[PDB]
Amino acid sequence: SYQPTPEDRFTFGLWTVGWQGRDPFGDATRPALDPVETVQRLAELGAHGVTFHDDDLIPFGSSDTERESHIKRFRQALDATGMTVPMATTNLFTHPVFKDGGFTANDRDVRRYALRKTIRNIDLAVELGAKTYVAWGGREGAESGAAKDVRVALDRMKEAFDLLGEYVTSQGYDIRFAIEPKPNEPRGDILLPTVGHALAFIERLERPELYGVNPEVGHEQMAGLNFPHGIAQALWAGKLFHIDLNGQSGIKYDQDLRFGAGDLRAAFWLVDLLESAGYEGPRHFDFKPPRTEDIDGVWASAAGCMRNYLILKERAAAFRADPEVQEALRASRLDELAQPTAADGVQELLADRTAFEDFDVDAAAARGMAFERLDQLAMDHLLGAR
Ligand SMILES: [Mg+2]
Ligand SMILES: [Mg+2]
Ligand SMILES: [Mn+2]
Ligand SMILES: [Mn+2]
Ligand SMILES: [O-]
Numbered sequence: 454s455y456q457p458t459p460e461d462r463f464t465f466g467l468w469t470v471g472w473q474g475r476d477p478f479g480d481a482t483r484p485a486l487d488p489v490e491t492v493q494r495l496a497e498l499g500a501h502g503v504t505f506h507d508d509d510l511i512p513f514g515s516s517d518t519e520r521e522s523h524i525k526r527f528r529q530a531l532d533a534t535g536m537t538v539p540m541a542t543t544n545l546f547t548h549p550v551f552k553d554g555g556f557t558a559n560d561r562d563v564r565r566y567a568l569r570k571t572i573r574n575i576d577l578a579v580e581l582g583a584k585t586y587v588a589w590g591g592r593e594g595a596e597s598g599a600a601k602d603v604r605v606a607l608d609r610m611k612e613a614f615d616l617l618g619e620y621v622t623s624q625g626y627d628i629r630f631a632i633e634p635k636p637n638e639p640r641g642d643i644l645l646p647t648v649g650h651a652l653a654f655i656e657r658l659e660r661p662e663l664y665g666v667n668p669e670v671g672h673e674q675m676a677g678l679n680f681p682h683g684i685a686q687a688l689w690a691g692k693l694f695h696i697d698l699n700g701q702s703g704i705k706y707d708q709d710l711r712f713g714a715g716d717l718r719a720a721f722w723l724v725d726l727l728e729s730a731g732y733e734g735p736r737h738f739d740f741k742p743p744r745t746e747d748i749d750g751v752w753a754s755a756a757g758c759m760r761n762y763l764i765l766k767e768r769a770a771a772f773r774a775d776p777e778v779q780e781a782l783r784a785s786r787l788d789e790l791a792q793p794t795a796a797d798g799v800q801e802l803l804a805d806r807t808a809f810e811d812f813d814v815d816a817a818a819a820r821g822m823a824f825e826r827l828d829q830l831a832m833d834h835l836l837g838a839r
Pocket of ligand 5: 669707709739
């Protein structure tokens with residue numbers, strides 16, 4: 454039971470299981486992993502694929518020959534295992550040159566470098582099969598108010614994404630972009646801090662259809678937001694191009710716990726939503742095995758990500774299939790929510806005395822919503838008490 458297979462579409466970043474455990478107050482607790490070892494270990498755990506930043510696959514500053522060497526060994530591991538690469542991204546955050554940003558660095562020469570670094574990796578991503586190219590603008594933002602003129606920075610951010618869209622259009626690539634929001638860390642405040650801000654920004658790009666979001670559980674929770682609700686808004690907009698699954702224990706530094714950890718009920722409601730919406734993309738884990746763990750704990754934590762998704766999938770399906778739940782949803786008027794409010798139009802609504810003049814507000818108000826019974830059925834299903 455709960456054994457993942459490639460059919461389940463689980464993916465992991467090289468940098469997840471490969472995290473050496475450096476944190477702001479700590480040196481590495483684990484050795485670097487060879488990407489080939491990661492591909493092989495994740496395949497044996499039942500993953501479907503991996504993702505990478507450029508600099509996870511090819512050490513920064515590699516010569517062209519070294520580059521090609523790293524890419525070849527990786528492609529041979531992918532090919533041997535049947536592991537895929539559904540998504541890739543650029544590291545525009547680790548190198549000190551990016552200390553004020555990539556695309557929105559105040560220094561123009563840095564902005565241009567960021568774009569070139571990204572374009573080089575888009576070409577590689579496409580060859581390896583990525584259908585989504587993620588941008589996490591972790592350095593875009595500020596610690597102080599005058600350091601960054603945010604309207605101007607948004608002009609630069611738009612200019613960068615529009616140039617990338619021109620490039621992929623020119624090349625005839627299939628690949629779409631996904632912006633990964635985060636509210637803070639490592640900048641005091643990060644630009645495009647939530648799913649909403651990223652969705653809004655996309656609508657001002659030249660080719661909006663090429664851009665969506667890559668929301669991460671823990672990032673929205675760093676703003677105290679409801680991650681299932683934000684995913685619902687992304688799905689409503691047609692913009693859930695990819696998703697990052699993990700756990701977060703509240704409003705604090707980005708913990709990147711394994712999926713299921715942190716806010717467990719939010720993980721349940723997320724799975725419920727993804728499955729009823731028919732999301733077809735990768736189930737990607739952007740997580741860190743805690744630095745307390747050795748390599749055996751790395752693979753246990755990765756396995757746990759997948760196991761928890763599968764348990765929650767079972768529980769959510771059982772919840773929605775239960776006749777008792779179907780009845781409680783009706784008792785709570787979830788069916789009525791789906792009826793148009795006024796398909797009859799403005800003039801019919803305005804002439805309808807049952808909508809105002811003759812509406813019995815007190816009788817309506819006295820009708821309980823029955824939400825607590827509904828939620829306790831949900832709790833019982835999650836806990837396997839049904
Ligand atoms: Mg390598
Ligand atoms: Mg554009
Ligand atoms: Mn995170
Ligand atoms: Mn992420
Ligand atoms: O993350």
